[PDB]
């Protein structure tokens, strides 16, 4: 649809473009809200708004309302990688309590795995799963005990994280500055300092695009000291 092409263009734009794409799709919800191809794009635009927003209650609102649109997209059919991908993203943005993070983390893993199964050549899903695995490996003993009681035990590993981050790089070299810092962290945590230094050098080559890109520059400067 022309509308959905315009929304795609605006999602790929600057901050002003992403805000316009959000309002463009909201303005069209009455007419197009029964269509899965519209719903996941509206969810995506909520996710854009959540990322661009600083004020905490406003950021939360975008993630909550976006997640409901992504759920409506998934009710239309289970075979859309885009539906599962953006549901996972919003799941993670909303989950930014331990009980709620655990249930969100279980849902995140199911949907990112389905996105990868449906569309394995999409680098973003692999990056998302790498970061999930890194976070799960880094849970405290108590947080793991709490997750095992609430859910199967969690057992994702630094190697699982590394393999997913490297798959994003293989599909799209330079996909993510944060991803390169996470690869370097993973190698250091494995005791592979030569590889960690290689990826630290490559991480320094990429620009910042996300809030996390800017935040993880702290971790990258700490690696330059550690290594
Ligand atoms: C396409 C488009 C451009 C601008 C806006 S507005 O920001 O709400 O006025 C909405 C939609
Ligand atoms: C399964 C699971 C549980 C908890 C987290 S957390 O968001 O890093 O706390 C992520 C994933």
Closest C-alpha among 67, 165, 59 to residue 111: 67
Nearest CA to ligand 1 atom 8: 23
Token digits of residue 227: 């290594």
CB 84 within 8 A of CB 119: no
d(C-alpha 152, C-alpha 86), whole Å: 25
Alpha-carbon distances, residue 37 vs 8, 43, 55, 196 (angstroms): 11, 10, 29, 41
Return the number of other C-beta atoms located less than 10 Å from residue 221's C-beta.
12
Checking the chain for breaks where C and the next N are over 2.5 Å apart, the residues before them are: 96, 151
| Nearest atom (ligand 1) to Cα of 24 | 11
**Token couple for 83:** 């539906």
**Nearest C-alpha to atom 3 of ligand 1 is from which residue?**
20
The residue to mutate among 96, 99, 100, 102, having the most atoms of ligand 2 within 8 angstroms of its beta carbon, is 102
Return the axis-axis angle of helices 36-52 and 81-95, rounded to nearest 10°. Answer: 30
Q: Cα dist. 43→74, 118, 134, 200 in Å?
A: 11, 19, 25, 34
Q: Can you say whether residue 139 is alpha, beta or left, with left for phi > 0 and alpha for psi between -120 and 50 degrees?
A: beta
Ligand 2 pocket list (CB less than 6 A)? 95, 101-102, 105-106, 135-136, 147, 154
Provide DSSP, 64-113: HHHHHHHHHHHHT-S--HHHHHHHHHHHHHHH--HHHHHHHHHHHHHHHH
CATH class of 6-226: mainly alpha
CB 180 within 8 A of CB 188: no
Specify the length of the chain in residues.
227
Cβ–Cβ < 8 Å for 141, 182: no
Angle at alpha carbon of residue 189, lines to 93 and 101, rounded to 5°: 25
Closest among 110, 125, 116, 136 to 168, alpha carbons compared: 125
Radius of gyration for the alpha carbons in the chain, expressed in angstroms and rounded: 18
Place of tokens 């390169």: 180
In sequence order, the 6+-apart residues with CB closer than 8 A to the CB of 197 are: 184, 227
User: If we measure between CA atoms, which residue out of 64, 81, 72, 66 comes closest to residue 32?
Assistant: 72
Take residue 214 and report the two structure tokens written for it. Answer: 């800017």
Query: Which of 63, 90, 135 has most ligand 2 atoms within 8 Å of CB, for mutation?
Result: 135
Burial class (CB in 10 A: 0-12, 13-18, 19+), 56: exposed
Ligand 2 atom 1: residue of nearest CA: 105
Handedness of CA 58, 68, 117, 134 (dihedral sign): positive
Other Cβ atoms within 10 Å of 151 Cβ, number: 12
Best residue among 10, 15, 18, 20 to mutate for probing ligand 1's pocket (most ligand atoms within 8 Å of CB) is 20
CA 124/CA 130 separation, integer angstroms: 10
Say if residue 150 is exposed, middle or buried (CB neighbours under 10 Å; 0-12, 13-18, 19+). exposed
Between CA 178 and CA 176 the distance in angstroms is 5
User: 14 CA distance to ligand 1 centroid (A)?
Assistant: 14
Which secondary structure element, helix H or strand E, spans residue 175, and what is its range? none
* CA–CA separation, 167 and 171 (whole Å): 6
Q: How far apart, in whole angstroms, are the C-alpha atoms of residue 79 and residue 18?
A: 26
Which tokens is 146 given?
């709490």
Q: Using a 6 Å CB cutoff, which residues line ligand 1? A: 20, 23-24
| Closest protein CA for atom 6 of ligand 1 | 20
Q: Which two tokens stand for residue 95?
A: 């989950």
Residue 58: CB partners within 8 Å, gap ≥ 6? Answer: none
């Amino acid at each position: 649809l022309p509308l959905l092409q315009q929304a795609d263009e605006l999602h790929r734009g600057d901050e002003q473009g992403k805000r316009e794409g959000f309002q463009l799709l909201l303005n069209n919800k009455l007419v197009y809200g029964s269509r899965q191809d519209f719903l996941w794009r509206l969810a995506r635009a909520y996710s854009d708004m959540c990322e661009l927003t600083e004020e905490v209650s406003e950021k939360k609102s975008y993630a909550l309302d976006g997640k409901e649109e992504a759920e409506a997209a998934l009710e239309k059919g289970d075979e859309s990688a885009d539906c599962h991908l953006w549901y996972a993203v919003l799941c993670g943005q909303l989950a930014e309590s331990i009980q709620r993070r655990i249930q969100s983390g279980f849902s995140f893993k199911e949907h990112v795995d389905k996105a990868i199964a449906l569309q394995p050549e999409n680098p973003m899903a692999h990056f998302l799963l790498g970061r999930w695995c890194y976070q799960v490996s880094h849970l405290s003993w108590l947080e793991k005990k709490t997750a095992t009681a609430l859910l199967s035990p969690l057992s994702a590993t630094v190697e699982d994280a590394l393999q997913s981050f490297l798959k994003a790089e293989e599909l799209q070299p330079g996909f993510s500055k944060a991803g390169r810092v996470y690869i370097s962290k993973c190698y250091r945590e494995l005791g592979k300092n030569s590889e960690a230094r290689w990826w630290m050098k490559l991480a320094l080559e990429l620009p910042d695009v996300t809030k996390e890109d800017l935040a993880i520059q702290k971790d990258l400067e700490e690696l330059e000291v550690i290594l």
